[PDB]
């Protein structure tokens, strides 16, 4: 056969080039198909990865072995302070693609937005949008009215300019992550009045997503630096007798073609790639004001979602959060993009209506056995403190 025993290829050709992403914030490459019957609604949101935890819930899947038994499964906690809408972007359809026709900015942009437009904000004069606010003031804002009329008449796709509130998260960063979110829904006139009314008005994760919704999570994975062939591609390690190194590919090509091909595994960069993980079910949309965010109808302990001692390397959660099933790309503190699913779900698993039973709040800084400080004091009695 001239390949004596043949095996499937190591790695996927659909994720090349495996290089550092050109961005740190995940990008929504494509938005849903925008049915014109449904009411106007946003289709994306941004949060920050806080960490992982485990839950218990009663499965419901007729025909499965665990049809009515309790299952332990991991979830990811994403901190989602409410986003502010500060802009409106209109797109027209051209024979060369989609083209941004005009952009409308609301007045009174916060410093979190204004920092995104500088590299040296500390020593700048902060002149951003200083001459622009005259458009809203002069001539009763006729300049802004003309731009809004342009979007309604010409544009076929309308998007809002979103804004995170990173000052509400326990991160040292003060730059806010700005984003475009497409207003899928009714007519173009409806989209503009929907977006215009949302100017400078906070938008909560509650309205965008529901409890049992299947979403896609977009983020940049964890970086690993320059790594070898075995780590990048998972090739077989060479026998220990090999002279010049074991963690290598033996044959990197035949004599002809007289070139090293693009399909051969080579050492280089692994991780920090842009990825779009799909088919993630939401389990809970917690409130930032409630004192019983982790409390269910079975476990009635008034405990918050933050584990004991806080999330490791993130902090506490004092905002709204989204509990999503499974693991998602990225690291802790990384800004992450949540997008509505572009598919249609008919599987019983996808359509399953989840209802939590218990949420773990034990410490992740070790083998924590207590779920709350009160339980720790009754078990251990009194200490020398």
């Amino acid at each position: 056969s001239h390949r004596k025993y043949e095996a499937p290829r190591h790695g996927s050709l659909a994720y090349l080039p495996r290089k550092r992403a050109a961005r740190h914030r995940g990008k929504v490459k494509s938005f849903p198909k925008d049915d014109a019957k449904k009411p106007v609604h946003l289709t994306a949101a941004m949060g920050y990865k806080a960490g992982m935890t485990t839950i218990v819930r009663d499965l419901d899947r007729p025909g499965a072995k665990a049809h009515k038994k309790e299952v332990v499964e991991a979830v990811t906690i994403i901190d989602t302070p409410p986003m502010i809408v500060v802009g409106l972007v209109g797109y027209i359809e051209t024979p060369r693609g989609l083209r941004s026709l005009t952009t409308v900015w609301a007045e009174h942009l916060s410093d979190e937005v204004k920092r995104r437009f500088y590299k040296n904000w500390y020593k700048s004069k902060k002149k951003a949008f200083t001459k622009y606010v005259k458009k809203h003031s002069d001539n009763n804002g006729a300049a802004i009215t003309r731009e809004l009329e342009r979007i309604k008449k010409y544009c076929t796709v309308v998007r809002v300019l979103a804004h995170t509130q990173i000052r509400k998260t326990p991160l040292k960063q003060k730059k806010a992550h700005l984003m475009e979110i497409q207003i899928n829904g009714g007519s173009v006139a409806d989209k503009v009045e929907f977006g215009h009314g949302l100017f400078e008005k906070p938008v909560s994760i509650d309205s965008i997503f529901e409890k049992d919704e299947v979403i896609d999570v977009i983020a940049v994975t964890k970086g690993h630096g320059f790594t070898g062939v075995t780590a990048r591609w998972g090739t077989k390690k060479l026998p220990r007798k090999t002279h010049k190194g074991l963690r290598k590919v033996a044959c990197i090509g035949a004599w002809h073609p007289s070139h090293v091909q693009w399909t051969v595994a080579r050492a280089g960069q692994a991780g920090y790639h842009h990825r779009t993980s799909v088919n993630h079910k939401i389990y809970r949309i917690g409130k930032g004001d409630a004192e019983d965010s982790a409390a269910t109808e079975v476990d009635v302990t008034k405990k918050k979602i933050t584990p004991m001692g806080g999330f490791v390397r993130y902090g506490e959660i004092n905002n709204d959060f989204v509990m999503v099933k499974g693991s998602v790309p990225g690291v802790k503190k990384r800004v992450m993009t949540l997008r509505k699913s572009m598919f249609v779900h008919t599987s019983r698993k996808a359509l399953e209506k989840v209802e939590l039973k218990w949420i773990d709040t034990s410490s992740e800084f070790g083998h924590g056995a207590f779920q709350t400080p009160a339980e720790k004091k009754q078990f251990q009695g009194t200490l020398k403190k």
Binding site: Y5, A7, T54, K65, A66, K69, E70, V71, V72, E73
Partner: protein, 136 residues
Amino acid sequence: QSRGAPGGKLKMTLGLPVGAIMNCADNSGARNLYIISVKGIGARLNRLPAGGVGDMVMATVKKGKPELRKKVHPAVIVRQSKPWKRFDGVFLYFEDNAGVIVNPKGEMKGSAITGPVGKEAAELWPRIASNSGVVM
């Protein structure tokens, strides 16, 4: 008819490749089970077939009655020392690896099982559950 695979078995850690020796946990007269292959294994280069609790395998008897020595018998794994978790999230493992000689139809060759039996073995094979004692 058909092939001896646990048709409905959930995923589990295997921890028992070929060339492994199990204790014989029944009164068939054997004292060892030498795993030569696992039923239902696919095909991937260099990868040894492996099985877990409740998996049917082909085995040979290295120690036991001379009537069981030079033959290949289908067997079923009922214990293993490699920890594994069920859908309930608890990680379980036994003291040693053990198996019972069975027939192609699944009926046990012996009549009594010595020691505990993993739950997966009991559910998949009715005759092992019937002749087993403590099952967990």
